[PDB]
Amino acid sequence: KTKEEHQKEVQYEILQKTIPTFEPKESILKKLEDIKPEQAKAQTKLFRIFEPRQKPIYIANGEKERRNRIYWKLKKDTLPDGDYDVREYFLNLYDQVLTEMPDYLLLKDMAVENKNSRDAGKVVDSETASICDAIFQDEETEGAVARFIAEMRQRVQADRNVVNYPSILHPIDYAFNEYFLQHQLVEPLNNDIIFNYIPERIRNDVNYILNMDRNLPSTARYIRPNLLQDRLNLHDNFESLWDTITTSNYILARSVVPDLKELVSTEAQIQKMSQDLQLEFLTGINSQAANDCFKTLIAAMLSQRTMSLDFVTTNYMSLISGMWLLTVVPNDMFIRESLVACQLAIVNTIIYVAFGMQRMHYRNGDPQTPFQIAEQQIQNFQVANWLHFVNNNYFRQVVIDGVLNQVLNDNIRNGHVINQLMEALMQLSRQQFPTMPVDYKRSIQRGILLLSNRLGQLVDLTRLLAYSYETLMACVTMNMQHVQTLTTEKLQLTSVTSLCMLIGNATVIPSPQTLFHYYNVNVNFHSNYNERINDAVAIITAANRLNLYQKKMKAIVEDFLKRLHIFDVAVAPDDQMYRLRDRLRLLPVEVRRLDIFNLILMAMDQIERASDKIAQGVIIAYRDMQLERDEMYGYVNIARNLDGFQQINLEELMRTGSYAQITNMLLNNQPVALVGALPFVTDSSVISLIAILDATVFAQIVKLRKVDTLKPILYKINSDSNDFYLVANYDWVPISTTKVYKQVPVQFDFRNSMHMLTSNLTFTVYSDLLAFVSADTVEPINAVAFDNMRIMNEL
Amino acid sequence: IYWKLKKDTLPDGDYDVREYFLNLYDQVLTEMPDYLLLKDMAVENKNSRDAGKVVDSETASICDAIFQDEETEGAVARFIAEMRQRVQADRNVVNYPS
Amino acid sequence: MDVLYSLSKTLKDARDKIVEGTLYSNVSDLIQQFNQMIITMNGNEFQTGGIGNLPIRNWNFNFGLLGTTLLNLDANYVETARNTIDYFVDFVDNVCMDEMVRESQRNGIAPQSDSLRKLSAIKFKRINFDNSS
Amino acid sequence: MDVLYSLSKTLKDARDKIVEGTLYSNVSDLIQQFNQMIITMNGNEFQTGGIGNLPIRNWNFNFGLLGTTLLNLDANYVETARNTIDYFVDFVDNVCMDEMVRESQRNGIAPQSDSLRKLSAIKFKRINFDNSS
Amino acid sequence: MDVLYSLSKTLKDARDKIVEGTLYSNVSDLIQQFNQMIITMNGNEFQTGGIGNLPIRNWNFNFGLLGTTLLNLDANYVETARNTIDYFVDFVDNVCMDEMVRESQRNGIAPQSDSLRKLSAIKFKRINFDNSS
Fold it and tell me: What family classification does the UniProt entry report for this protein (chain B) (predicted)?
């Protein structure tokens, strides 16, 4: 048998290596309970990309004007070669700004003292104060600017909770900040809102009383947790992931099941059962096993697991208890193997033995369960009716408050089927039971009498289970589908018998604090799942729209799965990963992230033009051109357009590798125009321009069949060049061949850069939403049910 | 670049040629693949500008050799760079280059 | 009954707002509607005709999902959409043609064609994009 | 004047496009517009009539908020939408009837009825919508 | 041809929907299309006229981009949109009135005017919003 067990372990390990779950089934509980809620992150400093600098200008003839004009520049200049790398950096910045997305701004605290204004007013940010000082000390500005900088005033309307501050920023930064301000995620928190946020089924109860004691401040600001339904349909073609999710839910549900108290003495019950069964087996009966079985049963019914049935057929009491088990738990909660095995054993060991009928010849896999055949073959009204009731006992599909749930039938809920089971068993007790030996029949019918003699306690136990299931299921947020899964949970038949024969008169309802703990943990997990799904779909959609084709979606899906804290990436199968990716590709992105991407794509041209370490492209033109004069630089090869020259994308040629076109167009001397993110060498050497150098910076393109090393040259001729005296003292038209596709950096304009911000005065962030409610349970003895009858009616 | 046999252990004599053919058939049948995985045999091509993956390491070596040879034209290089596996998981079918 | 009008509106929108050059952000909702419709209607077989000289034709539905990745619609997307657009236009034309002539003395409001009978079932009610005419 | 047209157009769009089965993406703009209109019109009262035999009626606005996160709207959403759609339809009918029968010698372009005078305030201008008519 | 109608539809929807006090989540697609159009058309030169009494005018697209980050459109944004809208409507009126009076004895379905010939290139085909008329 040991070799057989080794072989079965090998097979089950091969199966298990396709399931993302850690080896011990308890660390999932710790990881789930350690999942912090959606973190509230404010912005200590304003999100700014553009800052002003001081640069000298030149006369059109090429001498310094003595003026110091303010220009614009990036905070960080890290845009590398290649258009693809530029767009990859753009996607990285998109991710950075998505993570850095704030939720609420207290613009009063961010304000700093100002010295420029004579009214000792406030300013929004330290950077604004510094740039204001820079524009204040300098004397190259208008007087009306000074009047405005002296008369700019903040305003605080505390009654309506509105405050404004003046700011100086570039339009992109101001648009970003204003969009963040006006699209806040926080909503007012009223007593009615916090009262209706509590699940309504628990509110309607009478066992619990919900009293509002904490006083909500009139400035209550709370973030509504996301409650969107699942968008992946994790019930078909996702067996492994769904199994992992439902196992995690099973562990979490097992963590919150209350324990039983003061069951009847075990030793006395063992003695009585041994005497009554007339034994010449019954081992493994302890209160610990009963509690574990009860917790397993309730948790499995809650988290929609699948339960396998384990038994030893030599213990007929195991099948007798399994009769009750099948009556209470709907048969659709198990796997087909266990159901057919249990049905065949029960039918061919108790009933058909007692009714003088041939043993049920049967074939595995028929569309009808054996219980149906039993129903349409026995004309004894009691047991036939009971068999029919078990036959058509299935989970009922209902929708409550837009949440899908599976609930039991009403008849079992009030504890009434136990009377039917007891009557059927008592009918079997006095039955003739023909063609069976003496002691076996006597033991069978005496065990049946033993289980029948516990009618009131069984009724109380089953309806207590029903009430606990209702209460626990009330707070479930995510919907539960119903589909068979790979793995199962081992249910001990002996433990089921122990629970059936050892249930006392102890009422046990879930503790209110345990209920709220479970509800908070579940909603936190749901919020994390939804937000990670949203981030993943936004990342993939933005990368696809911006033409980033090398972004392996497998890495993004890997990160998304790993950030769920309940999986293990190193075990997942590739085909299921691809199916999940294809599911994700077709969902519409949430509006905030889409609008952020739209703003990024509308500002990307300006951002790329702003950098001085990158250029759009180069034109050679193979012809003499008069140099175009500019105010920023003395003499530059400025080409603000690509008119009249054919355009070829460098990155396209590089990735495709077809070098014939550019090689011919370079060797045969035809004008062209290369376009691509290329750094350029600044050449402050007029003699270097005289000795033509911008005609050999393309030879390496055909020498080594590569484009990354391509480093064009831009000539910057000014007075400070160590050789500028050639231009001033000699008469010659500035002649060159290579131009650079570049736009002049935007001149600093004050009347449009100035902007006013809008925000609330002050408030506090509330996320817990459970410290403001108290729920004191009634005395455990007097608990009632839906029908206003007491939960346990046996005393 | 032309085609040459990877193995050149064929002895002279037509009878020995037929013997070698019989041995080759026996080797092929003994090394028969029962279930043929295609995700395991995959090395990422360094030259596919669509970040594709190829079937065998030697296939990757051949692709690198062809992609980098200064005497070769650009059409074949672009065809090499255009290689990419397309996966259709809804019908449980994948395509690979070879 | 309204399902037919929703299908007609969906087909008209798909034919008019899906050409080369349109940015995807203009027709994202139409893309979602088309995906939902093609998913729900897939796998179900219909029949038309059966009276007069109106031809009897069968129907099938096995079509792929329209993409949602490219920033701006391209020609391949146009052809892929227009093939299914043509097939569905033919289908709705034959359905309405069959539903016109058939009539009954009682229950005039009640649809008389099996196509409409299965259209108003409990599984097809997920495509009611518009009722505005 | 424009606010009344905005109300009428919003009511038309809501009563048309809110039908069970449609994907939530088709009504995103409708949901936002309707929610803003409801949250802005609440806490207010109006009086209409006061001339001829028209029904002199007082109206109070204290309705609730519709749901926001739903994959597919069930019949509950449609019912709770219609229960206020009909009320708004009756209100617009009363306002238009009270406006039509009034007249004045001076400044006919400007609003005349007291309800229209009150509704011309800037605080209601957030209910403005498209002007395709 | 279709490009001109797409521009006309975009301008008409901009006239209808860009009013003070609206919600941005109702005209997002129109604003996106407008921004794409202004990006594409920027930096081009056009010539219109030649026959009859239609004046010879030169048109250059040099307008700046339009922000989309504000939750409610204000008067400043309204006038900023309106100025460029009026310029565009004058341009499209001029090109239409140029194209209307010209015809050919052969190949009359094809464009004949200079502006329509220029606007039939390959890149400009990336602007085509809707064909609903």
Answer: Belongs to the rotavirus VP2 family.
